[PDB]
């Protein structure tokens, strides 16, 4: 019963376009295909704008005021968005592919590189209300005979330098009166001109070409005219200049070469500050910080992004996304970390809070089909098409064990015992489930009985029963543990594609090729509910299709399903353009999400294969924090969260309940009532007010007297609040009071408080413990130094 909104995209950090530093220098804007991701370098946080383009983004720029961001796609369609509020402002079409966009340093005007034509337009006022037709063109310039490679603004907002494919750099005057001041075309380059820049004093102009030559231009007598006083050359053996940037204040030239290496130079002396290689792929984009200490690099081929502090020779950011689509995803049991698997065969570990890749594994030769954690969470297991199942420690980041069949059986699904001692994997060719011993690595036995390939597997977290599904049109429940072995087959109407296990372990859901989600009672093996999905799914006609989408039967089934940890919801995904969230007890659709709207993706709307990328979702899972769910898709890992909570979703209001009324109860020292009243209103700001205003002395009194119904909610609030809050001791006092007073009730109903209490454990473990670990060693380190005898 919660509202999920797209928050961020993990697994992809840069796809193409120009990266730009925020004016404050603390944030980096990386264009990610159809959207743009913003990274908080200082706070080490990341998020993605919700607004999206029709086609992959081409260019972006943010104003020095930091209020406006412009994004233009390959079709020239421009989207204007308020940076601060993250809301779209206006939609416009410039009707031509815009190579680059740059705001004037004043911010009043911005320039667009359109073919061989330069356009200068006026910036709308953010303060003014929404305008129907805000954009007005200041001027258009037609000097170049070929496409404009790039453009550079003067520091005074009076001149703009453009480098075009005519082997010519051409300067302009923003003011018509100042046309005589700057109406020069600079020639001499032997190859395409990449970048023209102004000196800080602006007397000197530096021009750079793809061949790797830098010309220094000065206005001097031979009466006065521009001349090439000095010439420099990049003597790269074969690498060609791909991107160039200049920082006039500190005189830095950062150049990315096509070989995949960049050089840092000091002008005009041409001193090579440093040279480094980020790989064999070309360096596509380079941007420089406002202060000039941080230099960011982007290569599209492997989707690489790196932020470099050349001052200290340190890496602020070093992140690279999957080359292939993410085949599967799995959250850490606490939800702090998520692991992703791609068709390449490489596994990457991501942190939810930071949104950054901590480590990557390359051991698997072929595509990794599935990934899963043990109940304890220290260990992660994976199965790949190469014919191996590999066990990974996430504390020490090592593959401590590998499992394989006798004949190198291809594995497509995997499941792990809650005890973390038995593993079961399934194959699309062998029809039999292989079982290994985690401790020993030997094949215990093979669970046979399926007349079809085993599509998916799962262990009950509590009962430890195994449920297996296939294209056999049946489900089999295996009681592997115990002196006696048994199999319980249940028949289903159609081929099974996906299976999810109830955290209680009493029910199982299965998705069939007919487009049905059927739920069965494990202990009895009878159906308990059935949900339709065929109508709800949205599938777009492919460009190659010769048959209509409505008549199409390509994908009206969900290839991945999972429950909510509370146990009342299912999120389902498949080879389609939709994510559907259902409400299990009564079989209805809660909400539906459009995974993508990129026109490039095929499903959005005799010698050669007509294959083009298509929108599809490989896997879906809920957050153990019960506030988000993530879906693996072609573009990357989409995460939808309920964090913002702008909705007013009260519980048990009465006329007496009012935000104003609550405050007197605080003023009237009636803390218990104020807390209960605030929860009834269910407003975070009011709850936070009451929570922080309760004195420490009265906490045990309030905790003992809280009604049972509000106990799960308050516990969830503290856990979610504490993980980022600074009042650990205040929070830790609250949990001690709550656990001491109501712990017995929690034990009586473990499932009701499962999600909330897990968040509490995360706070106690992932931050609180680290504090004492740093505190305790200092104490012992202290004692040794004082107690130990000093050296001779």
């Amino acid at each position: 019963k919660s509202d999920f909104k797209f928050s961020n995209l993990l697994g992809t950090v840069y796809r193409q376009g120009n990266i730009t530093f925020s004016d404050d220098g603390k944030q980096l804007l990386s264009p990610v295909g159809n959207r743009v991701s913003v990274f908080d370098l200082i706070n080490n946080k990341s998020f993605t704008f919700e607004y999206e383009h029709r086609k992959n983004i081409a260019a972006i720029d943010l104003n020095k005021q930091g209020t406006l961001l412009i994004s233009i796609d390959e079709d020239g369609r421009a989207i204007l968005v308020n940076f601060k509020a993250r809301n779209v402002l206006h939609h416009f079409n410039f009707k031509e592919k815009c190579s680059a966009v740059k705001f004037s340093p004043d911010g009043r005007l911005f320039a667009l590189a359109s073919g061989r034509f330069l356009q200068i337009w006026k910036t709308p006022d953010v303060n003014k209300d929404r305008q129907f037709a805000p954009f007005v063109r200041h001027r258009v310039h037609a000097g170049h005979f070929q496409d404009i490679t790039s453009l550079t603004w003067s520091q005074d907002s009076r001149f703009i330098l453009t480098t075009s494919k005519d082997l010519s750099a051409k300067i302009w005057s923003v003011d018509s009166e100042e046309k005589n001041l700057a109406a020069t075309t600079f020639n001499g380059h032997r190859d395409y001109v990449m970048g023209a820049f102004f000196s800080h004093d602006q007397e000197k102009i530096y021009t750079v070409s793809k061949d790797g030559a830098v010309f220094v231009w000065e206005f001097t007598k031979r009466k006065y005219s521009w001349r090439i006083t000095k010439k420099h050359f990049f003597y790269a053996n074969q690498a060609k200049v791909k991107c160039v940037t200049f920082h006039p204040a500190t005189r830095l030239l950062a150049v990315g070469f096509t070989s995949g290496e960049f050089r840092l130079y000091d002008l005009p002396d041409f001193t090579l500050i440093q040279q480094l290689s980020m790989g064999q792929n070309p360096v596509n984009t380079v941007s420089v910080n406002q202060t000039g200490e941080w230099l960011a690099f982007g290569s599209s081929k492997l989707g690489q992004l790196l932020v470099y502090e050349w001052q200290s020779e340190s890496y602020i950011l070093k992140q690279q996304g999957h080359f292939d689509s993410t085949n599967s995803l799995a959250y850490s049991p606490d939800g702090s970390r998520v692991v992703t698997a791609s068709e390449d065969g490489k596994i990457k570990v991501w942190d939810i809070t930071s949104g950054f890749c901590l480590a990557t594994f390359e051991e698997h030769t072929s595509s990794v089909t599935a990934v899963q954690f043990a109940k304890r969470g220290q260990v992660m297991f994976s199965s790949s098409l190469d014919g191996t199942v590999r066990a990974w420690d996430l504390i020490r980041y090592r593959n401590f064990r590998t499992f394989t069949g006798t004949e190198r059986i291809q594995f497509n699904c995997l499941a792990v015992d809650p005890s973390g001692e038995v593993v079961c994997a399934g194959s699309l060719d062998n029809f039999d489930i292989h079982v290994w011993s985690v401790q020993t690595g030997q094949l215990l036995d093979a669970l046979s009985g399926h007349e079809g390939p085993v599509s998916c597997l799962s262990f009950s977290q509590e009962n430890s029963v195994l449920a297996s599904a296939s294209w056999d049109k049946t489900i089999r429940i295996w009681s592997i543990f115990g002196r006696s072995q048994q199999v319980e087959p249940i028949e289903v109407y159609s081929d099974v594609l996906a299976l999810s296990m109830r955290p209680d372990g009493k029910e199982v859901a299965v998705s069939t090729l007919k487009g049905q989600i059927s739920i069965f009672n494990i202990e009895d093996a009878k159906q308990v509910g059935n949900i339709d999905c065929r109508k709800d799914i949205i599938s777009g006609r492919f460009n190659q299709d010769r048959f209509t989408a409505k008549n199409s039967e390509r994908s009206k089934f969900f290839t991945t399903i999972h429950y909510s940890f509370d146990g009342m919801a299912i999120v389902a995904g498949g080879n389609n353009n939709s994510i559907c969230l259902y409400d299990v007890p009564n079989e209805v659709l809660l909400k539906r999400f459009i995974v993508s709207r990129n026109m490039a993706l095929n499903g959005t709307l005799l010698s050669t294969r007509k294959m083009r990328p298509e929108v599809r979702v490989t896997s879906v899972q809920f957050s153990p924090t019960a506030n988000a769910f993530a879906a693996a898709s072609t573009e990357g890992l989409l995460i939808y969260s309920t964090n913002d909570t702008i909705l007013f979703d009260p519980f048990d209001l009465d006329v007496d309940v009012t935000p104003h009324s609550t405050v007197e109860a605080l003023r009237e020292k009636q803390f218990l009532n104020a807390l209960v009243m605030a929860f009834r209103l269910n407003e975070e700001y009011l709850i936070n007010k009451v929570y922080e205003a309760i004195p420490i002395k009265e906490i045990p009194l309030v905790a003992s007297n809280i009604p049972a119904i509000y106990l799960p909610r308050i516990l969830k609030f503290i856990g979610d609040f504490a993980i980022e809050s600074q009042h650990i001791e205040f929070n830790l006092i609250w949990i001690k009071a709550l656990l001491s007073a109501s712990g017995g009730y929690i034990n009586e109903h473990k499932y009701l408080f499962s999600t909330a209490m897990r968040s509490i454990q995360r706070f106690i473990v992932r931050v609180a413990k680290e504090v004492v670990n740093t505190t305790t060693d200092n104490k012992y380190t202290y004692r040794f130094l004082v107690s130990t005898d000093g050296s001779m």
Partner: peptide, 29 residues
């Protein structure tokens, strides 16, 4: 000249040459 004049609903309301020494390069050749 050198700036396009377009009369459109969105607009239309209202050279120096520098180059390298090629003759010296050619004389070098």
């Amino acid at each position: 000249s050198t700036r396009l004049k377009i009369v459109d609903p969105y607009g239309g309301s209202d050279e120096a040459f520098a180059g390298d020494d090629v003759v010296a390069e050619f004389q070098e050749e």
